[PDB]
Design a protein around this ligand. Structure first.
Ligand SMILES: NC(=O)c1sc(Nc2ccccc2)nc1N
Length: 282
């Protein structure tokens, strides 16, 4: 832009690049995303009215010189960096719980307003010194379509469903929750099929019993290997049983059986939730 002083590049994405920038005028520091249609307008314009404490605020939408810029409030750090920074000791469980609870609130809000994120990953969960965490980079997916991280992709997406639901965000958040707890990505695939098979190897190859309709999925192959489900206590060993029961509900194969963000918020795991302060190195 011209009204902004690009301080530094802070993020990448399929939909563009984000820069820490200063409003040459107001002097405010923001996150400026240069986007890489009309339905895009509605879609975006909607995002502007999608305000909640756990959703990164979209401050301005600039459509000039036939280019698209999104000005977001600047958050202090991303969860990916925080997790890496906390890898020797791990993020304290109360903070993990606080983050999960807040993200579920943000998703419950998005989903009640019929907005899907579609691409949740540690890099787009942003945190501040006050202990808040917020959803960012919705990625205005469902538009510019027709390397990329597949680790958090729901199975129905991998199997070719073209009309997936809010359940895909619960899945992604479940994966992130596991990773915060174990300090290792749950399903670190490096290809769509390896992603899919890593999920199958851990949760068991889905069948009509646990996922009615799965064998009719676009990319489902009868030739898929048949793996047994692994005992969950081996999946996320440091998580207590409440945490594990919530996680299993977030990772149900059937999108229709997968817990909703609203229902997840009432789960016993959050009975003792608090809002700790993270130790951030900025
Ligand atoms: N993508 C976004 O909307 C972002 S990224 C961000 N800050 C940040 C600061 C340090 C490290 C990584 C990200 N703030 C927003 N709004």
């Amino acid at each position: 832009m011209e009204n902004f002083q690009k301080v530094e590049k802070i993020g990448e994405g399929t939909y563009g690049v984000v820069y820490k920038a200063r409003n040459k005028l107001t002097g405010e520091v923001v996150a400026l995303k240069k986007i890489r249609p009309s339905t895009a307008i509605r879609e975006i314009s909607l995002l502007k009215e999608l305000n909640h404490p756990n959703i990164v605020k979209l401050l301005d939408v600039i459509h000039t010189e036939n280019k698209l810029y999104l000005v977001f409030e600047f958050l202090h750090q991303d969860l990916k960096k925080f997790m890496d920074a906390s890898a020797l000791t791990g993020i304290p469980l109360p903070l993990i719980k606080s983050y999960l609870f807040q993200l579920l609130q943000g998703l419950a809000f998005c989903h009640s307003h019929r907005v899907l994120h579609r691409d949740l990953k540690p890099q787009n969960l942003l945190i501040n010194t006050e202990g808040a965490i917020k959803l960012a980079d919705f990625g205005l997916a469902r538009a510019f379509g027709v390397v990329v991280t597949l680790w958090y992709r729901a199975p129905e997406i991998l199997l070719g469903c073209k009309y997936y639901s809010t359940a895909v965000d619960i899945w992604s958040l479940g994966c992130i929750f596991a990773e915060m707890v174990t300090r290792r990505a749950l399903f670190p695939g490096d290809s769509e099929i390896d992603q899919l098979f890593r999920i199958f190897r851990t949760l068991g190859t889905p069948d009509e019993v646990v996922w009615p309709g799965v064998t009719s999925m676009p990319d489902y192959k009868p030739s898929f290997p048949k793996w047994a489900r692994q005992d969950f206590s081996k999946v996320v060993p440091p998580l207590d049983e409440d945490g594990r029961s919530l996680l299993s509900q977030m990772l149900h194969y059937d999108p229709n059986k997968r817990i909703s963000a609203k229902a997840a918020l009432a789960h016993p795991f959050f009975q003792d939730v608090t809002k700790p302060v993270p130790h951030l190195r900025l």
